């Protein structure tokens, strides 16, 4: 019928144009993210950009703290970002409540994936236009990255990037794990993994950075933290002295 794509219904090609369109709204902030696995840590960086000075820079964020061990990095519009953040925090509380231990990242990936599926099966839900990266350090699975997308599909990774120009970053990561011959960087301090990540980002995007142009989130064991600008500056200085 004339409506195949104002509601979630297959096309004559056997398809969902609507969900496609969701994927075509993940590149509007044009933020890029890069996430790699250390040996005992997980590191993720994202861009920060403010179009005006009259914003306060602190509040502009894309790294959202969901659990105490799971960080969430969002690619796509910020309204949907906030709705997703709220969803996830609810589910985390509820897992702790019903099973007696904090939510694993894997379980969260899947819970959020199924909610996604439900938004693309009900004829009056609009799907989220956000790709979520879940970074964690598990004690049963180790440092892990799970990526879910508006489809409700998710997959694991050794490393991954997101954004409009994230192919460049894919090249970088590919070559890096080509030389290393192993699925994670062998580094025993989270600092140097931040450093490596920023190096690959400068190479990939072709542009140098500053403390107010970055945003860094680190998942160590049994915690998650974000660095402030002051600590990011120090990483940048130690890059030049490699």
């Amino acid at each position: 019928a004339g409506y195949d794509r104002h509601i979630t219904i297959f096309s004559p090609e056997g398809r969902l144009y609507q969900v496609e369109y969701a994927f075509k709204a993940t590149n509007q902030t044009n933020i890029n993210s890069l996430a790699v696995r250390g040996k005992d840590c997980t590191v993720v960086i994202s861009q920060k950009k403010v179009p005006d000075k009259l914003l306060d820079p602190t509040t502009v964020s894309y790294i959202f703290c969901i659990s105490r061990t799971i960080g969430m990095v969002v690619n796509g519009p910020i309204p949907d970002a906030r709705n997703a953040a709220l969803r996830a925090k609810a589910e985390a509380a509820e897992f702790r409540y019903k099973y007696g231990y904090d939510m694993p990242c894997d379980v969260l990936a899947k819970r959020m994936a199924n909610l996604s599926q439900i938004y693309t099966q009900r004829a009056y839900m609009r799907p989220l236009g956000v790709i979520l990266t879940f970074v964690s350090v598990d004690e049963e699975l180790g440092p892990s990255i799970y990526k879910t997308d508006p489809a409700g599909y998710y997959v694991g990774y050794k490393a991954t990037a997101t954004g409009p120009k994230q192919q460049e970053i894919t090249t970088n990561l590919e070559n890096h794990f080509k030389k290393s011959k192993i699925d994670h960087i062998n580094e025993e301090s989270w600092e140097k993994v931040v450093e490596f990540a920023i190096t690959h980002m400068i190479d990939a995007l072709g542009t140098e950075f500053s403390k107010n142009d970055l945003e860094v989130g680190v998942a160590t064991k049994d915690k998650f933290f974000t660095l402030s600008a002051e600590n990011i500056e120090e990483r940048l200085v130690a890059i030049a002295e490699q």
């Binding site: 403010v50 000075k53 914003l55 820079p57 140098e208 107010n212 200085v237 030049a240």
Partner: protein, 149 residues
């Protein structure tokens, strides 16, 4: 940026440390190394325009170091560090490196010292492909002559 306070502060410092330069300059007679540190901290700028100004204070200072017959070794290491420190506005540093080579021609050093300093300097800009290139070729042919004999 999100504040204009770094702007007001950085520019203003530049003017005032000209007033304090004669004080620094007499202090270098007692110990150059301490005066060197004072100007090095000065050059830490988060505002673009003040970079150009603060590098001029160091140029006058290092003439004393360059002329010396032990301390120019220490000078070559510094130039390295400056490009690395932050990048610090790709215009400022590129003007400095030139003015130093220009000084070297006029200070009149040993064949040997001239040779070894230049290799250290062309080495820095091998890792660069910006304005450096203009100067890099010119000092390269200056070095050609040295080995020609």
């Amino acid at each position: 940026m999100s504040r204009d306070a770094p702007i007001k502060a950085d520019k203003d410092y530049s003017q005032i440390l000209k007033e304090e330069f004669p004080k620094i300059d007499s202090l270098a007679q007692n110990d150059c190394n301490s005066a060197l540190d004072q100007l090095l901290v000065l050059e830490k700028k988060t505002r673009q325009a003040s970079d150009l100004a603060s590098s001029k204070e160091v140029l006058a200072k290092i003439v004393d170091l360059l002329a010396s017959r032990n301390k120019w070794d220490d000078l070559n290491e510094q130039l390295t560090l400056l490009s690395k420190k932050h990048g610090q506005l790709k215009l400022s540093i590129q003007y400095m490196i030139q003015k130093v080579m220009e000084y070297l021609k006029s200070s009149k050093s040993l064949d040997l010292n001239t040779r070894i300093s230049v290799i250290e300097t062309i080495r820095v800009v091998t890792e660069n492909k910006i304005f450096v290139e203009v100067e890099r070729a010119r000092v390269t042919k200056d070095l050609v002559e040295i080995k020609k004999e």
